[PDB]
Amino acid sequence: IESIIKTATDTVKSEINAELGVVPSLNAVETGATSNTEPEEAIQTRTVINQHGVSETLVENFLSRAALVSKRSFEYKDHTSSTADKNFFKWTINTRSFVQLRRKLELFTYLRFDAEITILTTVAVNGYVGLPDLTLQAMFVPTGALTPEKQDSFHWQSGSNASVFFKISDPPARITIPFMCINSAYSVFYDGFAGFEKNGLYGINPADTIGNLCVRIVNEHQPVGFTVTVRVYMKPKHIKAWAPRPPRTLPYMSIANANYKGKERAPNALSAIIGNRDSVKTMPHNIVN
Amino acid sequence: IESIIKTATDTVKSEINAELGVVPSLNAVETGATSNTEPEEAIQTRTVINQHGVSETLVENFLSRAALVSKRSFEYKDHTSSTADKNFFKWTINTRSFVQLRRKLELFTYLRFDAEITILTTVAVNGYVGLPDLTLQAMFVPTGALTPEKQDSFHWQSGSNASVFFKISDPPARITIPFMCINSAYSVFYDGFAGFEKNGLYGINPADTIGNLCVRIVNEHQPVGFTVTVRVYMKPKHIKAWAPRPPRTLPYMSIANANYKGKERAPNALSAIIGNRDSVKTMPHNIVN
Amino acid sequence: GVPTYLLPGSGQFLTTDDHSSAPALPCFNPTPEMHIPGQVRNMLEVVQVESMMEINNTESAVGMERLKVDISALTDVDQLLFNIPLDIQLDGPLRNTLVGNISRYYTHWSGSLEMTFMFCGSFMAAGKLILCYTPPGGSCPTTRETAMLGTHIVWDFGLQSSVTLIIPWISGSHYRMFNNDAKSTNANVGYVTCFMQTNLIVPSESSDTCSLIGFIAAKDDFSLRLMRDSPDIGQLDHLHAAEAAYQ
Amino acid sequence: GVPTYLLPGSGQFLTTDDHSSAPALPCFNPTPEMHIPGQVRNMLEVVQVESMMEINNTESAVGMERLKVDISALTDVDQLLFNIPLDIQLDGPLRNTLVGNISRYYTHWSGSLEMTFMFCGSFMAAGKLILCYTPPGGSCPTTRETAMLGTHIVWDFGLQSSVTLIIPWISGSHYRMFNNDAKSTNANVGYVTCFMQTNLIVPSESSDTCSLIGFIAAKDDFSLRLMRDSPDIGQLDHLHAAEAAYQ
Amino acid sequence: GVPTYLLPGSGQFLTTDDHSSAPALPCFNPTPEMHIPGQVRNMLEVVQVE
Amino acid sequence: GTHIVWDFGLQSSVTLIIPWISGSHYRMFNNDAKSTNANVGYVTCFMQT
Amino acid sequence: SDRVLQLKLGNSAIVTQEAANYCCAYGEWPNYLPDHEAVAIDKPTQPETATDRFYTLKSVKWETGSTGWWWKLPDALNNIGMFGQNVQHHYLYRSGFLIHVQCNATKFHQGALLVVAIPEHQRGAHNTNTSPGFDDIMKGEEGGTFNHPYVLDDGTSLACATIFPHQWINLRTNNSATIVLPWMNAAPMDFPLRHNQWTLAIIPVVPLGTRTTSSMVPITVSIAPMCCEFNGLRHAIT
Amino acid sequence: INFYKDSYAASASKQDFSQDPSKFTEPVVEGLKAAPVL
Amino acid sequence: INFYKDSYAASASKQDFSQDPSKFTEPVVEGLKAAPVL
Numbered sequence A, B: 001i002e003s004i005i006k007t008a009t010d011t012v013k014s015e016i017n018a019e020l021g022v023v024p025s026l027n028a029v030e031t032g033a034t035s036n037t038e039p040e041e042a043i044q045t046r047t048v049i050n051q052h053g054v055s056e057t058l059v060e061n062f063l064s065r066a067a068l069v070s071k072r073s074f075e076y077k078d079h080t081s082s083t084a085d086k087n088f089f090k091w092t093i094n095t096r097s098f099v100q101l102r103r104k105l106e107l108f109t110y111l112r113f114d115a116e117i118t119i120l121t122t123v124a125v126n127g128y129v130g131l132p133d134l135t136l137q138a139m140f141v142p143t144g145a146l147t148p149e150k151q152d153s154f155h156w157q158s159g160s161n162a163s164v165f166f167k168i169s170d171p172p173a174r175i176t177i178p179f180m181c182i183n184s185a186y187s188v189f190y191d192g193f194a195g196f197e198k199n200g201l202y203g204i205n206p207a208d209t210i211g212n213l214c215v216r217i218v219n220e221h222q223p224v225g226f227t228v229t230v231r232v233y234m235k236p237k238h239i240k241a242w243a244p245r246p247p248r249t250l251p252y253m254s255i256a257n258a259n260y261k262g263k264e265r266a267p268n269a270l271s272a273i274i275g276n277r278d279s280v281k282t283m284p285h286n287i288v289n
Numbered sequence C, D: 001g002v003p004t005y006l007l008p009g010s011g012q013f014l015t016t017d018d019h020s021s022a023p024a025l026p027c028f029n030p031t032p033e034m035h036i037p038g039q040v041r042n043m044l045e046v047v048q049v050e051s052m053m054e055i056n057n058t059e060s061a062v063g064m065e066r067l068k069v070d071i072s073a074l075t076d077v078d079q080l081l082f083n084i085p086l087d088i089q090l091d092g093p094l095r096n097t098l099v100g101n102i103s104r105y106y107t108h109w110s111g112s113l114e115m116t117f118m119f120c121g122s123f124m125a126a127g128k129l130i131l132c133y134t135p136p137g138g139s140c141p142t143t144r145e146t147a148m149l150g151t152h153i154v155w156d157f158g159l160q161s162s163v164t165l166i167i168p169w170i171s172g173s174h175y176r177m178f179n180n181d182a183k184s185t186n187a188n189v190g191y192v193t194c195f196m197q198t199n200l201i202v203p204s205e206s207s208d209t210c211s212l213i214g215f216i217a218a219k220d221d222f223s224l225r226l227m228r229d230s231p232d233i234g235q236l237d238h239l240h241a242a243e244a245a246y247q
Numbered sequence E: 001g002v003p004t005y006l007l008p009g010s011g012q013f014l015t016t017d018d019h020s021s022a023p024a025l026p027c028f029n030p031t032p033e034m035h036i037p038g039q040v041r042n043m044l045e046v047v048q049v050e
Numbered sequence F: 001g002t003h004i005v006w007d008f009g010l011q012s013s014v015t016l017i018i019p020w021i022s023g024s025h026y027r028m029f030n031n032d033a034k035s036t037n038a039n040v041g042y043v044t045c046f047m048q049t
Numbered sequence G: 001s002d003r004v005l006q007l008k009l010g011n012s013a014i015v016t017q018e019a020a021n022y023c024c025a026y027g028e029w030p031n032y033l034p035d036h037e038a039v040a041i042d043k044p045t046q047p048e049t050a051t052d053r054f055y056t057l058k059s060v061k062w063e064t065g066s067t068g069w070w071w072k073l074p075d076a077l078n079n080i081g082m083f084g085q086n087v088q089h090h091y092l093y094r095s096g097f098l099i100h101v102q103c104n105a106t107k108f109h110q111g112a113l114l115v116v117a118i119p120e121h122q123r124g125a126h127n128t129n130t131s132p133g134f135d136d137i138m139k140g141e142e143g144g145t146f147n148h149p150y151v152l153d154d155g156t157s158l159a160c161a162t163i164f165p166h167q168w169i170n171l172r173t174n175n176s177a178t179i180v181l182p183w184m185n186a187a188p189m190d191f192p193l194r195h196n197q198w199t200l201a202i203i204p205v206v207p208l209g210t211r212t213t214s215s216m217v218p219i220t221v222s223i224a225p226m227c228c229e230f231n232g233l234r235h236a237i238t
Numbered sequence H, I: 001i002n003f004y005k006d007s008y009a010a011s012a013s014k015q016d017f018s019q020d021p022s023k024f025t026e027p028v029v030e031g032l033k034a035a036p037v038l
C-alpha cells in the first residue's frame, strides 16, 4: 500500500517471546516475497525515534545530476586541403557513450524525463597567439530534417529548426528539451527489432529517436588553426521510472548493444564478479590485536 | 540562566557600605567559579546607561568570514615529457593548512556549519603573449569515489559527482556545501584513533571526512606554457559551537597533529610565552614627564 | 533600471544546480501519461528487495557455483561452516547485491540488514545451524562457543525452507562510511559466521551434500547519504560505434 | 525583460559579504541535531572566564614558574611587591589570557576588568596586601602612599583565599584602541601595583616564601569591536604534510 | 530565470550616483550617537552668517 | 566489593555497612566456617592516600 | 556548610570534610540517552549499581619536581570491575563520570593543584613532525605525566585551561575536588577502546612546600561512571 | 523562479515522498503473516 | 534574497542573542552569594 515516507522507521522496544506456533524468523523464499522478519522479532530492542531523512535516495535526486553525454574535438582552420570535421560536426544523439550515466539509467526499464542540456566549449591553439572569442551555432535536426553538409551551407539558416548561438566567453549555453518519445516513456531496454523486415536493428526502440545535434563555428577561419572541444551535459528532470533492473556488472563494449566480455580476472570477470578469497572460512580484513 | 543580551550592562550608582558579615570582594577560586564581585561593590559608582552593542562578538560573526583553505599552482602546458600536476590537481580537503583560519576554529571543540566556497583563479605566462580566458572544472569526489588520473580521463564526465565549470574572466566561482558530518557536529579535536587496529591515525575523527577536490583546466594545452594558481576560500555559516578551548600559543608544525616546538626565544617559546621584563617591579612602557 | 551586483559563483556550471531553463521547443505537447506497472519513486524500495550473496567467492567456483554454499555431514561437533565479510565498500559477497550496488552510489549509510538463508537439500535431509553476528572490535570468531555470545539465530531445517538473521544497526555514530579503510571505527560492521548446531543428516538415497543460498536486503530503517560516483563501472576508451555517431 | 544596469562593486569578492549561494548537493539531509554540553553563542561569554596572568614574565622563570609570584617576609614597611603592565596590545602578563587572546581579534574595547588573586601559602601564613589601580597620566607609583591615592582594595589573608580588584572603565572615550603606541591617550589604561599593607608572617614550620596566582577576566559591561587578524599566530612556510594533501 | 537586457550606462562609475552597496564589516555596531552643539543641515544656514 | 572511602576530618568516624547479602533467609553459627550456610566474606582496609 | 560533602553511588561512599563546593561541567548532569537522540536500535543493557560506583585508581606521589598527571576516560577504567567487563563485551558504550580527587597535608604545608577535566584532549608531541603513537596515548589505569604542562602538551596554555571544567586543591583551603561530567561526544554513543571523551588533568601550579618533617603526600583519584549504557553485545575483546 | 511559458522548462520536482515497496518485496496474492508462512 | 530550494544555501544567521555565560563562569552546584563564599 502506497504511503508517504519522509524518514526511516522507528524501532519499538521488545520483550522476551516463547510463543508456540509463532515463528517470525522462518520464511519461504520460494514464494518470491522478501523476508518480513522485523528486528523487534529477532532480538530484544530498545525504543529509537529515527530522524534520518530519505530524500537523497529519491529517484529525482538520484538521476537529476548533469552528466557528460557527448564530447567532440575538431580543428577550427582553413580546411580547403583537408580530407575531417571541417569547422562543424554532426552528432547522432544517444545516452549510451559514457558509462557512468549509462549505468545509472540502465537501473530502470522505463523512464520519462525532460532533458536539461548544458553545452561547454573550450579552445586551444594548435602547436601561441591568444584565444579567440568565437561564436558557435548548435542546431537540433529532428528525424527526417536535412543535416548541414558544410560550415556555410544554407541549412544553418534555421528557419524552423531550433538553434542556439553562444560565445566561448559566455557561461555554458543551456536549454531544456521536453520529453519527446512517441510513447509515454522511453524504453531504456528494448527486446525487439526496429523494422518490419528481419534485418532491422535489435535493441533500439524506434519510438525513442531524438535526432541530430549539429554544431558549427560561425566565424570564418583565422590565419591560424585552433582545436575546439564541445562537451554536452544532460540532466534528466521531472522523472518517472518503472521496473528496476539488475545493475551492469561486466564492462560495456558497445553503444549499440548489451554485448559483454568481462574483465580478464575477477573482479567483474565473466566467471567471477566478486574477487576471490582463500576459502569460505577466510576473513579477508580480520581485525587482529 | 539563558537570557537575550543585545548590549553591555548598565552600571547603577552605589553608596558607602560598612556592613558586617558582607565581603563581596572576597572570593574562592578553588570552587572553579569566576569572581562575582561587581564594580558597584568594589567602588562608589555613578549611573551609566550603556548602549554598546555586542553583535560583533557573536560566534556567527566571529567565524563567518571567508578565509583561504587551499592554494595550488600548476603548469598549463603540453605535459608529454614531464615527470607534476599535468593540467589538473587533486586536493584532500582539510581546514588545517593556513594558520589564521586554523587557530580561530580551534578555539572550539565542536562545530556544526555549512561551508560557503569561493574559488579564485589567476594565470601568468611562463618566462609575454596575453592571458587566455580558460575554462576550469572543479569536481567534488566524495569518499570511495574514484579520482581522475589524467586531464582527459572519463572520470571528468561527472555523471553523479557535483562539478562546477567556471571561466577565469568570470567572478570567482561560488557554491555552498552543507554540513555533512556523520555526527551532529564536527570534532575539531579528536582524542582518539581512526581505525579498529592500533596503527590508525591519531587525532582525526573519521566521521569528519569531506573528500577530494579535483580541478582541471578543460582547454587543451596551448603552444606556450602558463602557470595557473587556484585559491579556495571557505566561509562557515549557520554555525553552532561547543566547548571553548585555550588558544594555540606555539607555532603550528603539521596539518596532521598538534605537535609543538615553540619559537627559539620569547614570545611564544616553549619555556616563555610572554616576552621578558627586567623584573616583576619593572614597568616596560612607563610614562615619564 | 534595477541596480544590481554579481556575487561570487556567478556564471559557474554546477552539475547539481537546480534552475529553470529556456524551452527549446515552444508549445510542444508531450505524449499523454499512461499507467505502467512497477513505478519506483525512492531507491530505498529497491534495496529492500533481497538478492543473492556471492558467499562462495573462491577459486574453483565458476559462475553460478559462486552463489551457493555446499554443506556436508561432519564427524566432529560444533564445526565452522563459513563466514561472511560484511564490508560493503571492499570487494566481497555483499558487493554485487541490490542493497550493495545501490549503496555504492552513496558514502554514508545507517540501519539494519537482514540475511535470509534457503536450505536446498532434499526433503529427507535434516539439520540445525547457528548463524551469528559479531559486533566489531575483535577478530572474527572461529569457535561456536565464542560466536554464540553475539547476536544469533538457531535454525532448524523443516517445512519452512528459510531463516532470517537480522543484523541490527549497532553503531556509536548515526552513520557508517563506505570507507576503503575497512578497519576504521567509522566503517567496520563486524562479522557473520555459520556453525553446525547439530549435523546434516541424510539417508543413503539423498545426496550427501546440500546447498544454502544466502540473500541480503536492507530493512526499512535503512538510509543512504552523500551521492558519489560508483566505483563499479569505468571506461578506458570510447565504446565501439561511439565514434560512428559522429559520422 | 527587465532593464538593468550594473553598479560599482559588481563582480567583486568581498570576504565579509553575506549572500545566499548555490547548493552543490541538492536534497542532502544533514544529521539530526543533538544536544551537546557547553554551547557558546557570544565570544563575550569566554572573556568573562578568569584565566591566569603571566605576571612573573622574567628571565629565570621557566614555564609554570611564570604563572606565580613569590612573596617573602620583609624587614622594611610599606614595600612594593610587583606591578602589572595593563597594555593588552603590547606583550605582557595580560596577553596570553582568555580575555587577552579573544580581544586581540578586535581593535576597540570598552568596559571594566576584574583581577582576582589567590593566596597559596600555608594555613599558618598571615598577611595584608594593598592592590592599587592608577588611572593613566603619570608614572607608575613606586611608593605605597602614592599608590594608595588611586582605586584600591586592602586584602587580609583568611579563610576566603582570594580577593578581587575591579579595574573600572574610567575613560574619556567610549572605547580604547589596541594600539602598538602604548603611550597614546586612546590606549593607555594606567597601572596595577601591589604593596605590603602589613607583612607576610609565618611560623618556623611553614615555608618562608608564599605564592600568589593572579587571574583576570572581563565583566559583563565589556564590549569588543572591529574584527582584525590576531597578531598571535603566523606561518613562514607550508606546514608539514600540507603538500602531501595534493599527492 | 528572469529574462533581462542591459541598458546603456551599464557598468559605469558615475561619481554622483546613489545606490546601496555591500557592507564590508557585517554586524558592526557604530558608536552610539551623542548630542553635539552646532549641527548644520543645510549650507544656506552658513551663508546667512555675516 | 562494597566499600566506603573515608577522609579524616572534623567528623572522627565512618560507618561501613555490611549489608545482608545471603541466598538463605538465615546463616548458621557453624564451627565449619567454610560452609556455604555460614561464611559471610571479609572486611579489608587499605590506604586510599 | 558546603565544606562537607558525601557522595553515595552503588555500594560505595565518599565523605570529605574540606570540599570547595563542586563543579557540574557546563551546568549539565549525566542522563541516559533519550529515544529521540538514539541511533543503535538494540535494547541497551543498563547495569546500574554494578557499574555506577566509585573506582579508586593507584595513588601518585606529589614531589617538588612533579609536572602533573593525567588519565583518559574511559581508557583508565576499561579493565576495572564490571565496568571493564561491560566495555570489553560491547561495541558501544555511553556514560557520564563523577571525579573525586583527594590530597591532604598539614596546616604547615602549601601547594596548589589545578584539577581540570579536558574534553577531547588530543595530545601533541614535542619537537617532531610524527604524531603521537598508540602507546603514548593509551596509558590505562596508570595514566600519564605531563611533558610540558605549561602548554598542556598540546601547544596551547595552562593559563587558559580554566575555560575547562575545573577546581583547585589549595592545601590551605581544601583537601578535595569534585567534578561531575556529562556525556561529551559528537555521537550519542561510542566505541570505548578507540576514543577518549575526557582527560582528567592534575597540575601543580604551586609546588608542594613545607618546613615540617617531610611525609609522602599522595594524590588519589576516585571515579564513578554515571548512567552507563552498553550496546552491541558480542564476545569480549579483552 | 520560472518565467518560461512551457511548464517542462521548470526546475526539478524533488517533493514526491510516496512509496510502495510491497510491489517489489511482497508481490504475492495472499499477504503473509507476521503462523508459518507456508 | 534566497531562491534556492535547499535551506542550507541561505545567507548567514546573525540574530541569536541568547547567552548563558554561567555555564562557564559559575558551574558550581550551589549558587554563590552576592556572606563569605565558603
Ligand SMILES: COCCn1cc(-c2ccnc3c(NCc4ccc(OC(C)C)cc4)cccc23)cn1
Residues within 6 Å of the ligand: A069, A093, A094, A095, A105, A111, A115, A117, A138, A139, A140, A162, A163, A164, A175, A177, A186, A187, A188, A208, A210, A213, A232, A234, C024
Ligand atoms: C534513458 O535514456 C533513453 C532516452 N533518451 C533521452 C535522450 C535525450 C533526449 C533529448 N535530448 C538529448 C540530448 N540533447 C542534445 C540537444 C538537443 C537539442 C538541442 O537544441 C539546441 C541546438 C537548440 C541541444 C542539445 C542529449 C542526449 C540525450 C538526449 C536520449 N535518449
Ligand SMILES: COCCn1cc(-c2ccnc3c(NCc4ccc(OC(C)C)cc4)cccc23)cn1
Residues within 6 Å of the ligand: B069, B093, B094, B095, B105, B111, B115, B117, B138, B139, B140, B162, B163, B164, B175, B177, B186, B187, B188, B208, B210, B213, B232, B234, C014, C015, D024
Ligand atoms: C573545523 O573544521 C572541521 C570540519 N571541516 C569542515 C570542512 C569542509 C567541509 C566542506 N567543504 C570544505 C571545503 N570545500 C571544498 C569544495 C568541495 C566541493 C566542491 O564542489 C564543487 C566542485 C561542485 C567545491 C569545493 C574546503 C575546506 C573544508 C571543507 C573541513 N573540515
